[PDB]
Amino acid sequence: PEWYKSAVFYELSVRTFQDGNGDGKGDFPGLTSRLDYLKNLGVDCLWLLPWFPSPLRDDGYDVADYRGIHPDLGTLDDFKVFLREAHARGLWVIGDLVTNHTSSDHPWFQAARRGPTLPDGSPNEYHDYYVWSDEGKEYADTRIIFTDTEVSNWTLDEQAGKYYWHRFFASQPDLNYDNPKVVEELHGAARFWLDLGLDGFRVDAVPYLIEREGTSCENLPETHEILKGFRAMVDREYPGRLLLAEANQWPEEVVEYFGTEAEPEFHMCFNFPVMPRLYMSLKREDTSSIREIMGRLPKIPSFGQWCIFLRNHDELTLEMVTDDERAFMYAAYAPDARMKINVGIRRRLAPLLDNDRRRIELLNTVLLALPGSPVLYYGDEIGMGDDLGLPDRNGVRTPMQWNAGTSGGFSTAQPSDCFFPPIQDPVYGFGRVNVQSQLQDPSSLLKWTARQLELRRAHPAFAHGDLTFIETGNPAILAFTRQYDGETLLIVSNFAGNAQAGLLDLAPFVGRAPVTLSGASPLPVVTGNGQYPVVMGKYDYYWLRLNS
Amino acid sequence: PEWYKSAVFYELSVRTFQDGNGDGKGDFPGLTSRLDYLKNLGVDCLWLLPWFPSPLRDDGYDVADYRGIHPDLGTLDDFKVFLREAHARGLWVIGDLVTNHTSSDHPWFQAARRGPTLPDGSPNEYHDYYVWSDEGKEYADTRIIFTDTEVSNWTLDEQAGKYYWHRFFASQPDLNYDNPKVVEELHGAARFWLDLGLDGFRVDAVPYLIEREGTSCENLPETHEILKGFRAMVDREYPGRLLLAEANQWPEEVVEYFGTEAEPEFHMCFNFPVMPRLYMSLKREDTSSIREIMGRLPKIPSFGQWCIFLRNHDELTLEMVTDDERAFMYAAYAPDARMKINVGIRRRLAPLLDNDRRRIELLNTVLLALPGSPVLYYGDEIGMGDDLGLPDRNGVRTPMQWNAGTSGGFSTAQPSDCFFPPIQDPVYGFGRVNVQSQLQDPSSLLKWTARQLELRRAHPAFAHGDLTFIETGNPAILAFTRQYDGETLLIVSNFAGNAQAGLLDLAPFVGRAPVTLSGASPLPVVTGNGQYPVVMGKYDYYWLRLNS
Amino acid sequence: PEWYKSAVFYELSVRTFQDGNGDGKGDFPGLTSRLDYLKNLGVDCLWLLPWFPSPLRDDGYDVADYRGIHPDLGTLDDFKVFLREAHARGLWVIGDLVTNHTSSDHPWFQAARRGPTLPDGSPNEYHDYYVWSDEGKEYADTRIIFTDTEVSNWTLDEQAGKYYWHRFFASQPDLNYDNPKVVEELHGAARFWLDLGLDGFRVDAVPYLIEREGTSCENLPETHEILKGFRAMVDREYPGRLLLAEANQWPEEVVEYFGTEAEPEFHMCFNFPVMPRLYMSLKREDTSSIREIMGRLPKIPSFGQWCIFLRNHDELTLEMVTDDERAFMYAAYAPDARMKINVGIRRRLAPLLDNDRRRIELLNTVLLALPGSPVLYYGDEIGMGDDLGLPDRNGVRTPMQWNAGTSGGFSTAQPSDCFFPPIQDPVYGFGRVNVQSQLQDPSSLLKWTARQLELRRAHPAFAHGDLTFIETGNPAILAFTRQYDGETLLIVSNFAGNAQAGLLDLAPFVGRAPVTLSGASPLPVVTGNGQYPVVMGKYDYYWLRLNS
Numbered sequence A, B, C: 001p002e003w004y005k006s007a008v009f010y011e012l013s014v015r016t017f018q019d020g021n022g023d024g025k026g027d028f029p030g031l032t033s034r035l036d037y038l039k040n041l042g043v044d045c046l047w048l049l050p051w052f053p054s055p056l057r058d059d060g061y062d063v064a065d066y067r068g069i070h071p072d073l074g075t076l077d078d079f080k081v082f083l084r085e086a087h088a089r090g091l092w093v094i095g096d097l098v099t100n101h102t103s104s105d106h107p108w109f110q111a112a113r114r115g116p117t118l119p120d121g122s123p124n125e126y127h128d129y130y131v132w133s134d135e136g137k138e139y140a141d142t143r144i145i146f147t148d149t150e151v152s153n154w155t156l157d158e159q160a161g162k163y164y165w166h167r168f169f170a171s172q173p174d175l176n177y178d179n180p181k182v183v184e185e186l187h188g189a190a191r192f193w194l195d196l197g198l199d200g201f202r203v204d205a206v207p208y209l210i211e212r213e214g215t216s217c218e219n220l221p222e223t224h225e226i227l228k229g230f231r232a233m234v235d236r237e238y239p240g241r242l243l244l245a246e247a248n249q250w251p252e253e254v255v256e257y258f259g260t261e262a263e264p265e266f267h268m269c270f271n272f273p274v275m276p277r278l279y280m281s282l283k284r285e286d287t288s289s290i291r292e293i294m295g296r297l298p299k300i301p302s303f304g305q306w307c308i309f310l311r312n313h314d315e316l317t318l319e320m321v322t323d324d325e326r327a328f329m330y331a332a333y334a335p336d337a338r339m340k341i342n343v344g345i346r347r348r349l350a351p352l353l354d355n356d357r358r359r360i361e362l363l364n365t366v367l368l369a370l371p372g373s374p375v376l377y378y379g380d381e382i383g384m385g386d387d388l389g390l391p392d393r394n395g396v397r398t399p400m401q402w403n404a405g406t407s408g409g410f411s412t413a414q415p416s417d418c419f420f421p422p423i424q425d426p427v428y429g430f431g432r433v434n435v436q437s438q439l440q441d442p443s444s445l446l447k448w449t450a451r452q453l454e455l456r457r458a459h460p461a462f463a464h465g466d467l468t469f470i471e472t473g474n475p476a477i478l479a480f481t482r483q484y485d486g487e488t489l490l491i492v493s494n495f496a497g498n499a500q501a502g503l504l505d506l507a508p509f510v511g512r513a514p515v516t517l518s519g520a521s522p523l524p525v526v527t528g529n530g531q532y533p534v535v536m537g538k539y540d541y542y543w544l545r546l547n548s
């Protein structure tokens, strides 16, 4: 099959990974010098956060030039060496294609805000690149996203004398997508990078492209047709390149972003629905929500693969959970006011699980065992924490912690001169949490993530098998099978903080002996009614092979 | 004497040595271009791993066709050139005869599985080719060999509706040697390759041919009979060709596989008894087990030679050691569960000795100075590592490392496209460990190996002399003599990491000076009671001649 | 006692150790980022090569500003940060003080060469800073040091129309120490850096300060007097700092550079006389030169410590050995013409010993076991090679090799943009020889060197003891004792490539039991008349204590 289903993804921010030149800002030269690290870890595809020239009011998601490299990050030549050194190691690389919007600093917008007509009486073709209103009464009662910052989705441009549309910050004007020229401007941005050998795109904020009155302005089939033709552009001109969608919607809406077999859209979507039910289930010690929402996912096209994740550069989103579930998650996972932002929790993985490695390893094994491809978030494989003294979501985007030398080894410059300060607290700082330390530590989390990704690699049912949940008799225990190519895997996990027991409904498998994927130690044969007793300790994960 | 008595052997796998044409698979044209390297190393006989057509579920030890060349390796023409060119260089070649079993894919088994009688009533002559049972309760309490994969030595064939026998994988059904038609299918399979000029065979899994109730199904007198008739055949139709047995059994059962003068069996068997004791002694700094298992070896026929070896394409086998011996070896040499498989340790020689050249050289000098003919495992002469992310025993069968270019010089294809990934880790990777490196390096393991073989060749007592152990007064120091044709070699070797003192019982040799084989530097003459005091540095090996 | 008697020194070159900003040149930010490496290695004092502003016609030993930081290396703030971080880790630092001469680009010399009298008829105070002759016929019959470049020690200045003196390159005019203003300018250079906290100075080319007619212009009493004044100044104004002298003279004249108890000079001098004899003896397999030269060295003052070294940033100097010894050394260690330069051999340690780790380990242990404090040349602890296609002695100054990524870890710039190109040959290139590789290799030369130093730390008789050579009966075996604080170390070393036997004269120690410093393994007790038989392997080092 396609390369993205066997892939392990790793999300990083070039400005934050390795500063190669002492100026305090990560760049492609330094990132290139770390490529062996990512290779040796068991990563396959690097997803890089936006690398474009930008005033960095949304850390690079306000693009001011789709066709350059931000000067903090080096040059386009540094980009081409990096992509060269990447593929030379067997790694794929995808970028972040910020389609929905541009920075107010983009040349397109500085021209649109002159007016609908120029001072020489000509039409201004750049004015209909964005969505304008005279009073700003359209689409009202539609959801604000950055609720802690923006009081509305319409803001008044003082020089253009009209309101303009923006689903995100005021300085990120929504692009107007009924205009087929804008459709062509981003087809030709996708082309500029796919020409240089880039292996695909993560596509940012796909649900909110088209806006239609009297609807929610999400998942409009008009938006889906823009994606349907983006896929056809790629299918024809750049076969084998990966399109991956950020679609945080409820399960039935999310699969629409794959398309159908006849009309394809995205190869991969992020599994935003299962992500919060992992954390809920851990605090409730009850895995029902994991099975419920996973059963609300319709089957995907042949070419589709889910992208599974635990965290990313954004807050932990609570936009697609019920009001009760959102209230529970604030109570369980956000004790301090400061950890809240925009209907979500802005904390790293390791802090959220109270730095419990037992819980960390648990959710990692479930990330690795659910159907799809996993994406690790840079630094989670060593246990990085966060700095909520930093505004917006930049509390999870601190520099990668390489050693206990200057600035954690991220730069030769001092921590106060780095773009974001490297974390230095007693628990998560780079004196305690860094790569070099965990390569010498025989038992480190880094070693453990590498070993576990090896354990996955060697069992292709993880990447391509089916899922069948299996009754356990205990809500704390979640059991499922993965079948593919006649290998059958049994993946039992305890979500509770003490010893739990269960009766697994292994009736399809009477006469088979489960044995461990690690060490090939055999468990007792399934017999009789197929009801198989287990005890598990707190947060244990049993990874098992059903030998027939 | 016989040619295999003076020979240095070298075990390689065609699929994995050298890829000629760029498709990622080693082949006979590639192997042919490397015969000069092998010649110059000091090697006399190549033993190749199974080259026959095969679905490769045991890396070609599941044979689908005894009279062909697997398409990966080229053609039978390519085979014929290879054997001409090897013979042109004074090299012998022996193949691998997989007698005990064939692949489920072999057209024999596809026929035998259609039942005891044909759809037209007539009896199916191929059915009695394999061993069957209606309930599969026979031969129980017989050892499983691949304990990590197979729950039983019987497996149900869904179409023939009965159980068949297999000492190894379920896709490797045993051949029925009670049926004398099977004995003749292998004689004629042997005849095929001997007719083409091949100089011999290593025979695979010879203890497990015949199975009988109430016995362990190992070293059965019936099995030996079949072997006796195999040597009687070869002795008659193909004098001078070589039969070498893989018989891992305890000292008293292994010597049986030579036969007697009156009734001969193999010319050579692998000296498995001493092999694990070499490693134990290094870890205990106690050379006792070596002398004890060597002492339990009864004298072998005139024509017979032991095949001495440190490692191979299989795990380090812990099947013929005591329970405490086995448990000690796991502790000392398998820190990870990953390192274990099937009552043994799946690791290359250099990793087993922590890449300590001083230890690597020591076991090699003992390999070269024990009585028999040494075999080198391919790549251990430049110190290759292993890859334990690869399943089964594949982790010691990664591609040979010729230089630091694309895929270590094994192929123009990417490492990802090689049949096994060429090792690229910072310690053993082909950037650090390769043949071009070590032909330039004046002191490399490669040149050391070539010189030690050169030194051995100069002293025929190494290949044909007797073995008298000598008292040292220090379990850490192993001392013995070799006596042949008037030469007396004295082989003192320290198995301890620190300096060690010893008093050697050279009472028989009072009046004679010991002198070094290398450099002709004499030690003090032996005098008086001939208790000869010696000091040794860590892992030191003294190769010495006793003057006359 | 004093800190430099217990210190392990480490010689590095900032421009060549670690580049912290991508410009291909090592700098102090970079060197700061590598301080934990040196700390963990067991290094105590960093001797940094000249770091001053200079046109680098002799790699910075032609100084053009004694009170600044060469812009390649960063700023004086960077230097202050480095000194703070070095001291924060218990590391001392010393600089290289180029006393005998400045660059012709030095402000003083641009001034001096204007003439004795300026355009306005008034005299030029800087003319008498340097050594001038009207026809250049003085001090005739005086050695030329840089014989492959310079034809005379007098050169005609174009503008001054006179001859100036230079024991070195013509772009390094000798300072004139009969002028007392000169003497004050270098007390003043000393004070500047000694005021920033620098712990001392390696003093360059100290024998050749004062020149006098009718002498060799070496080791003259007037030169020693200026050095006594330099010691007096530091003794009073900066107690506790280190003056270390580079004086390669014959054993008699070397010891003068310590001064007397009453009129002290240098705290330490390099033990140049012994350095070639270590190499002579390894090739002859006869250690009498080691003993003869060590015994021509008179006792040193109470404050004196020797500095022992195998190699450095220069050539292996053959200036102070006989004509026959020098011809031998050329035959043994300079097969190619390209390997000689000015009475000496310009190769790194590992190439000199054919990359034989047995011989590298032997001479390193003698380095650690002779009387003195040891200085390690950077990269020798990982086995770095040389690049003899670079001019002068730069072949041994190639960038440190850290990992196997871009430029070996030395810089993110490409190798072709690095000040000197990092080695990439198949034997010594950073793809085979680098720090990260050798941290993962359980048996690397780096770990060996670390552990051998730790062994040395544990036994103060190495730093502080006396030395008595011990008869052996075999010139290939060098045996001596180190006695201090009633601890008695016996050190035995074989300089030949085969086994060697000998009879240690241990009469002073009858009744004592020798044990290995590593492992505490006992040799037999000395009995009888203390004539102790020993056998050694090739290049063995027995490191023994005599248990009382």
Ligand SMILES: OCC1=C[C@H](N[C@H]2C[C@H](CO)[C@@H](O)[C@H](O)[C@H]2O)[C@H](O)[C@@H](O)[C@@H]1O
Pocket: A058, A061, A062, A168, A172, A204, A205, A246, A248, A313, A314, A315, A316, A317, A319, A342
């Ligand atoms: O509901 C999904 C989300 C989308 C949005 N994430 C993407 C779109 C935004 C475009 O400017 C950007 O801030 C964010 O980093 C992107 O990954 C939003 O910011 C998140 O808070 C939120 O969890």
Ligand SMILES: OCC1=C[C@H](N[C@H]2C[C@H](CO)[C@@H](O)[C@H](O)[C@H]2O)[C@H](O)[C@@H](O)[C@@H]1O
Pocket: B058, B061, B062, B168, B172, B204, B205, B246, B247, B248, B313, B314, B315, B316, B317, B319, B342
């Ligand atoms: O008891 C000795 C052994 C025999 C077996 N080795 C041979 C039998 C198998 C036949 O299919 C084959 O996999 C293996 O490579 C052969 O050399 C076994 O696999 C080993 O693990 C083991 O050391």
Ligand SMILES: OCC1=C[C@H](N[C@H]2C[C@H](CO)[C@@H](O)[C@H](O)[C@H]2O)[C@H](O)[C@@H](O)[C@@H]1O
Pocket: C058, C061, C062, C145, C168, C172, C204, C205, C246, C248, C313, C314, C315, C316, C317, C319
């Ligand atoms: O006689 C000993 C030596 C001193 C000299 N070494 C120092 C003096 C030179 C001063 O310019 C300089 O080139 C060298 O690096 C210094 O360490 C000479 O250049 C060497 O070749 C030689 O080994």
Ligand SMILES: [Ca+2]
Pocket: A100, A174, A175, A176, A177, A208, A209, A210, A211
């Ligand atoms: Ca939009």
Ligand SMILES: [Ca+2]
Pocket: B100, B174, B175, B208, B209, B210, B211
């Ligand atoms: Ca059988």
Ligand SMILES: [Ca+2]
Pocket: C100, C174, C175, C176, C208, C209, C210, C211
């Ligand atoms: Ca002078």
Ligand SMILES: [Mg+2]
Pocket: A019, A020, A021, A022, A023, A024, A025, A026, A027, A072, A073
């Ligand atoms: Mg930068």
Ligand SMILES: [Mg+2]
Pocket: B019, B020, B021, B022, B023, B024, B025, B026, B027, B072
């Ligand atoms: Mg091929």
Ligand SMILES: [Mg+2]
Pocket: C019, C020, C021, C022, C023, C024, C025, C026, C027, C072
């Ligand atoms: Mg620099």
